[PDB]
Amino acid sequence: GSHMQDPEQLKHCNGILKELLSKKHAAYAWPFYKPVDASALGLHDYHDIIKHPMDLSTVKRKMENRDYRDAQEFAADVRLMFSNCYKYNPPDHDVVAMARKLQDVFEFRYAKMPD
Ligand SMILES: CC(=O)N1c2ccc(-c3cc[nH]n3)cc2[C@H](Nc2ccccc2Cl)C[C@@H]1C
């Protein structure tokens, strides 16, 4: 059920999203900008292992389309994006180090949600 605070919380989520897409974090955010193109990367098992792909451009489209009804729904997609990375890639892969750094950006700012 919609709460009076959902619009303000979604503004906080949009601020986080803008930050994740900003030049400040681009050195480690870039793998997450667009859907994994498994065929182009030669990762022909990706869609057998990952049931629900997610990436920042999809989160952005969903935000722009008013798909997210609350902050927790937004957070679930961001965390799904990171979880897919941790599931598919070896834990010592460069992309996993990037995911951990970007997830730190996300989690610490998400924790500051007005409530
Ligand atoms: C998000 C994610 O999990 N992945 C992902 C997605 C997109 C891209 C991408 C986009 C444009 N060029 N490459 C690359 C990767 C990862 N590779 C990778 C990443 C950083 C350094 C070195 C390497 Cl090898 C594989 C993995 C499946």
Side-chain angles (χ1 to χ4, degrees), residues 30-32 36 41 43 85 89 93 95 98:
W30 67 264
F32 309 98
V36 173
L41 295 172
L43 306 176
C85 186
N89 299 282
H93 196 290
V95 77
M98 297 183 191

Side-chain angles (χ1 to χ4, degrees), residues 28-34 55-57 81 85 95 98-99 102:
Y28 37 93
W30 67 264
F32 309 98
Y33 283 170
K34 299 292 298 298
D55 70 282
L56 291 172
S57 75
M81 180 185 79
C85 186
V95 77
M98 297 183 191
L102 197 67

Side-chain angles (χ1 to χ4, degrees), residues 1-3 5-31:
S2 275
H3 191 282
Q5 79 199 340
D6 289 338
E8 170 172 11
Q9 292 194 338
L10 285 167
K11 293 284 190 171
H12 184 69
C13 292
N14 196 52
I16 293 169
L17 176 61
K18 294 293 176 196
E19 176 170 2
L20 298 183
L21 287 165
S22 72
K23 283 300 192 153
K24 175 175 184 171
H25 302 298
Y28 37 93
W30 67 264

